[PDB]
Amino acid sequence: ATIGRISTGSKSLDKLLGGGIETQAITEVFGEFGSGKTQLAHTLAVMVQLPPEEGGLNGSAMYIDTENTFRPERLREIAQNRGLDPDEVLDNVAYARAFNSNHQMLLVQQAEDMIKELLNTDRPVKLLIVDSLTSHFRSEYIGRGALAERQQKLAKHLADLHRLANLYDIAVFVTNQVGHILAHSATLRVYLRKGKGGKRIARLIDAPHLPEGEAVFSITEKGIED
Ligand SMILES: COc1ccc([C@H](C)NC(=O)[C@@H]2CCCN2C(=O)CNC(=O)c2ccc3ccccc3n2)cc1
Numbered sequence: 130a131t132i133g134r135i136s137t138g139s140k141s142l143d144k145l146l147g148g149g150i151e152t153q154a155i156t157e158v159f160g161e162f163g164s165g166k167t168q169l170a171h172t173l174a175v176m177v178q179l180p181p182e183e184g185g186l187n188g189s190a191m192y193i194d195t196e197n198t199f200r201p202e203r204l205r206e207i208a209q210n211r212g213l214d215p216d217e218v219l220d221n222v223a224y225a226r227a228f229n230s231n232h233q234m235l236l237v238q239q240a241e242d243m244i245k246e247l248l249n250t251d252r253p254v255k256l257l258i259v260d261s262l263t264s265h266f267r268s269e270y271i272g273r274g275a276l277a278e279r280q281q282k283l284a285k286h287l288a289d290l291h292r293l294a295n296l297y298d299i300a301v302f303v304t305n306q307v308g309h310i311l312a313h314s315a316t317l318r319v320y321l322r323k324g325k326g327g328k329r330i331a332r333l334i335d336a337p338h339l340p341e342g343e344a345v346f347s348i349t350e351k352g353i354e355d
């Protein structure tokens with residue numbers, strides 16, 4: 130199936146990604162709090178809803194929140210500033226708070242039911258966000274020799290998400306707090322950092338196949354833009 134791409138709202142970041150966030154892939158965005166990873170998740174939850182000439186996939190979004198990061202008023206602001214109806218935009222986002230890592234796994238199985246339901250409609254699910262993927266796994270699988278079991282549980286969770294992305298042609302977008310020696314299984318990893326007082330900077334990590342460079346974007350009333 131053709132890969133679909135969702136615009137991030139920034140021409141700079143879209144160029145770095147090769148057009149935007151891809152379906153049939155897991156894109157992992159990592160950085161410090163406020164680096165723009167949650168702002169990007171919120172922007173994408175709106176952008177995916179737009180028609181393709183506007184950078185979307187005429188789709189709906191599903192958002193798994195592990196750290197109480199979801200702000201429905203922020204989605205409303207992005208939608209209104211982009212010429213969209215905020216209530217209709219919120220109606221196209223399914224939201225769930227994951228209480229722990231095991232509940233986070235169950236939520237992914239429930240996501241598949243909604244995805245299957247809407248697959249052949251005029252507005253299928255096209256984006257699944259997990260913000261953040263690792264927080265519960267890092268707090269639960271902790272201490273002496275916990276690395277092996279945590280990485281096995283994370284590897285399994287990521288395999289389930291890769292399956293939803295590939296089987297249903299959806300973009301899976303996950304965020305992560307930031308160690309350097311651990312393995313990662315995302316299709317694409319993006320490092321975000323706070324820039325020159327106002328900007329945010331993005332770099333691709335371990336992607337020889339994709340272009341060398343860094344993107345610069347801003348957090349605005351429209352979510353993410355140049
Ligand atoms: C004014 O404050 C607001 C606060 C939040 C919202 C959000 C956008 N909308 C909702 O909360 C809506 C309205 C009430 C129920 N509801 C759900 O989305 C219920 N969700 C689910 O049943 C569900 C199930 C499995 C899932 C697996 C993965 C990800 C998400 C999943 N969501 C809107 C306004």
Ligand SMILES: [Ca+2]
Nearest residue numbers: 165166167168
């Ligand atoms: Ca952020």
